């Protein structure tokens, strides 16, 4: 037995192995745009991805992860609600079985077809494993995906998924530029939260972009051909790998824009 997204091991079960699932600053949440508070003391995001060095793409049994070299300040996030410098370590997606679901965050109860998470860790803690133990240890940039026109910058990712169909498989994935995954605007909401997968640690500063990117029906369809299972095991399609919205509790969502 292990946690997953099935009927018998899904989000509603996670609290048994990971009690923090019922904690005070769990993610994702519903962003209520009318009760979000505009904060003019919030700065612009500074995204510096021009020296980013992608290494590998991996099917870890619940998503696929594109990994980056985080040994130096190559791809960093600064500004916004953050204090200090956050290094990009990986990005991954959450998606659905149908176009009308897939995102983790929702906006006035609207679900998007998928959600992209660019995960960064605060360099003052020296390594990722130390960072996740701290309340200001990670920053995650969340980007919604809607189905419309194709996203050209996503296609290199889509074309390599056949080679990592099953859990545990990995492929070399160098020279991918994550700047091709960003929307035009960097307007955002931000709130303190958690990882949305076990161990669900409450160490994340969420930065959710307002503007979705559009991908084609064909591109998201390829996501849905991946497998939760390992090679030689019964085929389980990797779909609906999203956690539903959690209670906001004593938190406020702030907006960088009016
Ligand atoms: Zn995620």
Curated annotation (Swiss-Prot):
Its cofactor is Zn(2+); Co(2+). Optimum pH is 6-8. This is Carbonic anhydrase 2. Changing residue 196 to S/V: Reduced activity. The gene is CA2. It is linked to Osteopetrosis, autosomal recessive 3: A rare genetic disease characterized by abnormally dense bone, due to defective resorption of immature bone. Osteopetrosis occurs in two forms: a severe autosomal recessive form occurring in utero, infancy, or childhood, and a benign autosomal dominant form occurring in adolescence or adulthood. Recessive osteopetrosis commonly manifests in early infancy with macrocephaly, feeding difficulties, evolving blindness and deafness, bone marrow failure, severe anemia, and hepatosplenomegaly. Gene3D superfamilies: Alpha carbonic anhydrase (3.10.200.10). The active site is at residue 62. Changing residue 104 to D: Normal CO(2) hydrase activity. Changing residue 104 to A/Q: Strongly reduced CO(2) hydrase activity. The record marks 5, 60, 65 as: Fine-tunes the proton-transfer properties of H-64. Changing residue 115 to Q: Strongly reduced activity and sulfonamide affinity. Activated by X-ray, histamine, L-adrenaline, L- and D-phenylalanine, L- and D-histidine, L-His-OMe and beta-Ala-His (carnosine). Changing residue 197 to S: Enhanced p-nitrophenyl acetate esterase activity, but normal CO(2) hydrase activity. It comes from the Eukaryota. Changing residue 117 to D/N/Q: Reduced activity.
């Amino acid at each position: 037995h292990h946690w997953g997204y099935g009927k018998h091991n899904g989000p509603e079960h996670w609290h048994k192995d990971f009690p923090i699932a019922k904690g005070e600053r769990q993610s994702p949440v519903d962003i209520d745009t009318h009760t979000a508070k505009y904060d003019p003391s919030l700065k612009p995001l500074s995204v510096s991805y021009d020296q980013a060095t992608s290494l590998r793409i991996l099917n870890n049994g619940h998503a696929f992860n594109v990994e980056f070299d985080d040994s130096q300040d190559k791809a960093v996030l600064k500004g916004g609600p953050l204090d200090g410098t956050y290094r990009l370590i990986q990005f991954h997606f959450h998606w659905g079985s149908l176009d009308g679901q897939g995102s983790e965050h929702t906006v006035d109860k609207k679900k998007y077809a998928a959600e992209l998470h660019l995960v960064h860790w605060n360099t003052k803690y020296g390594d990722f494993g130390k960072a996740v133990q701290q309340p200001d240890g990670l920053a995650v940039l969340g980007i919604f995906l809607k189905v419309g026109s194709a996203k050209p910058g996503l296609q290199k990712v889509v074309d390599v998924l056949d080679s990592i169909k099953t859990k545990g498989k990995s492929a070399d994935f160098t020279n991918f530029d994550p700047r091709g995954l960003l929307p035009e605007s960097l307007d955002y909401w931000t709130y303190p939260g958690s990882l949305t997968t076990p161990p669900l640690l409450e160490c994340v500063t969420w930065i959710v972009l307002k503007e979705p990117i559009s991908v084609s029906s064909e591109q998201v369809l390829k996501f849905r051909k991946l497998n939760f299972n390992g090679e030689g095991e019964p085929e389980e399609l990797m779909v609906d790998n999203w956690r539903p919205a959690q209670p906001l509790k004593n938190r406020q969502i702030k907006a960088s824009f009016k």
